Amino acid sequence: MSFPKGFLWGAATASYQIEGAWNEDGKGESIWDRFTHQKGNILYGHNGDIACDHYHRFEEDVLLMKELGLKAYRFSIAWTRIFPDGFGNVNQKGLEFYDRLINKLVENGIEPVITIYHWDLPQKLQDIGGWANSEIVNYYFDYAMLVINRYKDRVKYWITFNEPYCIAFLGHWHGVHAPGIKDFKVAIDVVHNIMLSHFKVVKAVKENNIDVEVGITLNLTPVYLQTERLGYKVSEIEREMVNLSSQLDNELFLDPVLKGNYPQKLFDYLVQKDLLEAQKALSMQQEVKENFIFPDFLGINYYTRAVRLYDENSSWIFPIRWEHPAGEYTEMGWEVFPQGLFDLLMWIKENYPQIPIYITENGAAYNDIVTEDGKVHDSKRIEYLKQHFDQARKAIENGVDLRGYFVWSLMDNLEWAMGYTKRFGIIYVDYETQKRIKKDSFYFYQQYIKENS
């Protein structure tokens, strides 16, 4: 089986993780500027003030993409470069920068794929509630249509949101991401405002006849039962509670994006447990059904699975615990489990309406060292990628409409609250000299593209 003719072999980045220049050219403060400037949020006190300095070095970075042979490149636009206050006046230097990057990409025959919101909310919008405030829907819509209408001639693929689960729960429940809020009820409100924001943009693109594909990116985690790994008999309560726990990861976002409702089992449980007010639950259901519209594609960030079992003494919002199967793990503590990419893709094809799928993020963090002859022999990353590439091809053979694959990441970068301690790039970045050093995985990916395109 071959990959289909125009398969988008890509790599992926996000603005706050690579761009630096956090306050040049009138760029507004984002919630991640504020978050990394507070003590105790980021390992070793790292921040994204400089990052990979991609704001200044983007030309050389695009030439490495041309050397790599990428068919596409996924990046995000920093909202605070365009609207320093979230609302208000447009900033010309911000538009100028993305104008130059997008044109350099088109110039070198690389399809741009743009994530509109990749977590860097204007701090001025946080100051009036951020994503917990329903007016955010319109502030996001005005920003999203400005960049779609400006770039639609050069950019055919648009992603409204990257990983809503994180924006909501890690940003507003666990408090481990910006804005650092800790309130499950605010987190659900965030989930809702994101869905409405996503719907309003998709509808605007269809109604105005704008010839672009618009999608959304969800991080999905196939959940497996420890009991079934052990060959025990699965009780019905255990299956019920593990499925509730996996609806919080996956169906809570797939269901409204692809079917126009939230998952009913989860909502009942959350209401029963006083985690979610019953009126909001009915209101959210009503508002999503009214505003729902199908997207043009689904983006899937896949890294690993979860193995879970039932436990009535758990401190989690569901009575479950996590188990740790034997095998290979990364610097993230994530099981290397390529079969989960295939199972997930088959599970998507069989449970939701037909839709084109792109793997918009997949990759692995290993503790890379530069050798004496300036190489980086990341054979563990090569093995990770090779095995997941193979599951993707296998899924295509089984009828999954998989149209692209974007490796995370093109270059080492700031890994949010882990700082720069986790390297995901196929390109090593020396953060003291900003030198880019192609890892061995760069040449493997280069060869894999050449022979599957």
Side-chain angles (χ1 to χ4, degrees), residues 417-429:
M418 309 304 149
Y420 308 92
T421 77
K422 316 292 166 185
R423 304 193 169 261
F424 277 95
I426 57 186
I427 287 165
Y428 184 97
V429 184

PDB file of all heavy atoms in Angstrom, residues 417-429:
ATOM      1  N   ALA A 417       5.135  24.200  30.126  1.00  0.00           N
ATOM      2  CA  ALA A 417       5.601  24.273  31.511  1.00  0.00           C
ATOM      3  C   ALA A 417       6.798  23.376  31.780  1.00  0.00           C
ATOM      4  O   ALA A 417       7.366  23.457  32.865  1.00  0.00           O
ATOM      5  CB  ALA A 417       4.468  23.933  32.487  1.00  0.00           C
ATOM      6  N   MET A 418       7.185  22.528  30.833  1.00  0.00           N
ATOM      7  CA  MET A 418       8.436  21.790  30.929  1.00  0.00           C
ATOM      8  C   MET A 418       9.648  22.617  30.517  1.00  0.00           C
ATOM      9  O   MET A 418      10.773  22.106  30.592  1.00  0.00           O
ATOM     10  CB  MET A 418       8.393  20.527  30.059  1.00  0.00           C
ATOM     11  CG  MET A 418       7.178  19.650  30.265  1.00  0.00           C
ATOM     12  SD  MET A 418       7.021  19.165  31.980  1.00  0.00           S
ATOM     13  CE  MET A 418       5.230  19.021  32.102  1.00  0.00           C
ATOM     14  N   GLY A 419       9.454  23.861  30.066  1.00  0.00           N
ATOM     15  CA  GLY A 419      10.584  24.634  29.568  1.00  0.00           C
ATOM     16  C   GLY A 419      11.221  23.952  28.360  1.00  0.00           C
ATOM     17  O   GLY A 419      10.569  23.185  27.627  1.00  0.00           O
ATOM     18  N   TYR A 420      12.526  24.204  28.166  1.00  0.00           N
ATOM     19  CA  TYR A 420      13.291  23.591  27.079  1.00  0.00           C
ATOM     20  C   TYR A 420      13.897  22.266  27.474  1.00  0.00           C
ATOM     21  O   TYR A 420      14.784  21.789  26.764  1.00  0.00           O
ATOM     22  CB  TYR A 420      14.416  24.517  26.598  1.00  0.00           C
ATOM     23  CG  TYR A 420      13.935  25.895  26.266  1.00  0.00           C
ATOM     24  CD1 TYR A 420      13.959  26.895  27.226  1.00  0.00           C
ATOM     25  CD2 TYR A 420      13.435  26.194  25.005  1.00  0.00           C
ATOM     26  CE1 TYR A 420      13.487  28.173  26.942  1.00  0.00           C
ATOM     27  CE2 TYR A 420      12.975  27.471  24.700  1.00  0.00           C
ATOM     28  CZ  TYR A 420      12.989  28.447  25.673  1.00  0.00           C
ATOM     29  OH  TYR A 420      12.520  29.711  25.376  1.00  0.00           O
ATOM     30  N   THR A 421      13.447  21.667  28.591  1.00  0.00           N
ATOM     31  CA  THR A 421      14.000  20.389  29.033  1.00  0.00           C
ATOM     32  C   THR A 421      13.565  19.224  28.157  1.00  0.00           C
ATOM     33  O   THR A 421      14.159  18.151  28.252  1.00  0.00           O
ATOM     34  CB  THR A 421      13.585  20.077  30.469  1.00  0.00           C
ATOM     35  OG1 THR A 421      12.226  19.628  30.468  1.00  0.00           O
ATOM     36  CG2 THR A 421      13.732  21.311  31.391  1.00  0.00           C
ATOM     37  N   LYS A 422      12.517  19.382  27.355  1.00  0.00           N
ATOM     38  CA  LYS A 422      12.033  18.324  26.470  1.00  0.00           C
ATOM     39  C   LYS A 422      12.292  18.747  25.043  1.00  0.00           C
ATOM     40  O   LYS A 422      11.795  19.786  24.614  1.00  0.00           O
ATOM     41  CB  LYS A 422      10.538  18.049  26.653  1.00  0.00           C
ATOM     42  CG  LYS A 422      10.095  17.996  28.076  1.00  0.00           C
ATOM     43  CD  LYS A 422      10.673  16.776  28.746  1.00  0.00           C
ATOM     44  CE  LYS A 422      10.519  16.909  30.272  1.00  0.00           C
ATOM     45  NZ  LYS A 422      11.168  15.815  31.050  1.00  0.00           N
ATOM     46  N   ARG A 423      13.063  17.954  24.324  1.00  0.00           N
ATOM     47  CA  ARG A 423      13.380  18.209  22.933  1.00  0.00           C
ATOM     48  C   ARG A 423      12.579  17.235  22.074  1.00  0.00           C
ATOM     49  O   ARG A 423      12.696  16.021  22.247  1.00  0.00           O
ATOM     50  CB  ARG A 423      14.881  18.063  22.697  1.00  0.00           C
ATOM     51  CG  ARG A 423      15.726  18.974  23.603  1.00  0.00           C
ATOM     52  CD  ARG A 423      17.174  19.023  23.089  1.00  0.00           C
ATOM     53  NE  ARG A 423      17.964  20.059  23.739  1.00  0.00           N
ATOM     54  CZ  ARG A 423      18.227  21.254  23.228  1.00  0.00           C
ATOM     55  NH1 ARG A 423      17.749  21.630  22.038  1.00  0.00           N
ATOM     56  NH2 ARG A 423      18.997  22.089  23.918  1.00  0.00           N
ATOM     57  N   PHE A 424      11.773  17.789  21.149  1.00  0.00           N
ATOM     58  CA  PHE A 424      10.899  17.074  20.211  1.00  0.00           C
ATOM     59  C   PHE A 424      11.330  17.252  18.750  1.00  0.00           C
ATOM     60  O   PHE A 424      10.749  16.623  17.863  1.00  0.00           O
ATOM     61  CB  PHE A 424       9.442  17.582  20.334  1.00  0.00           C
ATOM     62  CG  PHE A 424       8.614  16.967  21.454  1.00  0.00           C
ATOM     63  CD1 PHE A 424       8.501  17.590  22.703  1.00  0.00           C
ATOM     64  CD2 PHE A 424       7.879  15.799  21.233  1.00  0.00           C
ATOM     65  CE1 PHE A 424       7.684  17.042  23.727  1.00  0.00           C
ATOM     66  CE2 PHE A 424       7.088  15.238  22.261  1.00  0.00           C
ATOM     67  CZ  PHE A 424       6.995  15.870  23.504  1.00  0.00           C
ATOM     68  N   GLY A 425      12.311  18.110  18.471  1.00  0.00           N
ATOM     69  CA  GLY A 425      12.648  18.443  17.102  1.00  0.00           C
ATOM     70  C   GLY A 425      13.321  17.317  16.340  1.00  0.00           C
ATOM     71  O   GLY A 425      13.942  16.413  16.905  1.00  0.00           O
ATOM     72  N   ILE A 426      13.153  17.368  15.009  1.00  0.00           N
ATOM     73  CA  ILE A 426      14.089  16.692  14.129  1.00  0.00           C
ATOM     74  C   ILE A 426      15.276  17.581  13.820  1.00  0.00           C
ATOM     75  O   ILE A 426      16.175  17.177  13.075  1.00  0.00           O
ATOM     76  CB  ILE A 426      13.392  16.232  12.835  1.00  0.00           C
ATOM     77  CG1 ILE A 426      12.745  17.406  12.104  1.00  0.00           C
ATOM     78  CG2 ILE A 426      12.363  15.180  13.161  1.00  0.00           C
ATOM     79  CD1 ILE A 426      11.917  16.955  10.900  1.00  0.00           C
ATOM     80  N   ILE A 427      15.296  18.789  14.359  1.00  0.00           N
ATOM     81  CA  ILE A 427      16.386  19.734  14.212  1.00  0.00           C
ATOM     82  C   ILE A 427      16.748  20.163  15.617  1.00  0.00           C
ATOM     83  O   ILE A 427      15.884  20.636  16.363  1.00  0.00           O
ATOM     84  CB  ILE A 427      15.996  20.951  13.339  1.00  0.00           C
ATOM     85  CG1 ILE A 427      15.889  20.579  11.850  1.00  0.00           C
ATOM     86  CG2 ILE A 427      16.982  22.125  13.519  1.00  0.00           C
ATOM     87  CD1 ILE A 427      15.158  21.646  11.025  1.00  0.00           C
ATOM     88  N   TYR A 428      17.997  19.958  15.995  1.00  0.00           N
ATOM     89  CA  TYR A 428      18.458  20.384  17.301  1.00  0.00           C
ATOM     90  C   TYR A 428      18.668  21.891  17.284  1.00  0.00           C
ATOM     91  O   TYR A 428      19.144  22.460  16.291  1.00  0.00           O
ATOM     92  CB  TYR A 428      19.752  19.652  17.644  1.00  0.00           C
ATOM     93  CG  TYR A 428      20.299  19.930  19.011  1.00  0.00           C
ATOM     94  CD1 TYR A 428      20.045  19.059  20.075  1.00  0.00           C
ATOM     95  CD2 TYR A 428      21.087  21.045  19.240  1.00  0.00           C
ATOM     96  CE1 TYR A 428      20.557  19.313  21.342  1.00  0.00           C
ATOM     97  CE2 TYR A 428      21.594  21.309  20.492  1.00  0.00           C
ATOM     98  CZ  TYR A 428      21.333  20.443  21.537  1.00  0.00           C
ATOM     99  OH  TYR A 428      21.856  20.736  22.775  1.00  0.00           O
ATOM    100  N   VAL A 429      18.300  22.548  18.377  1.00  0.00           N
ATOM    101  CA  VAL A 429      18.561  23.969  18.508  1.00  0.00           C
ATOM    102  C   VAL A 429      19.463  24.176  19.717  1.00  0.00           C
ATOM    103  O   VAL A 429      19.099  23.836  20.852  1.00  0.00           O
ATOM    104  CB  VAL A 429      17.272  24.791  18.629  1.00  0.00           C
ATOM    105  CG1 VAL A 429      17.624  26.295  18.671  1.00  0.00           C
ATOM    106  CG2 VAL A 429      16.292  24.445  17.474  1.00  0.00           C
TER     107      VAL A 429
END
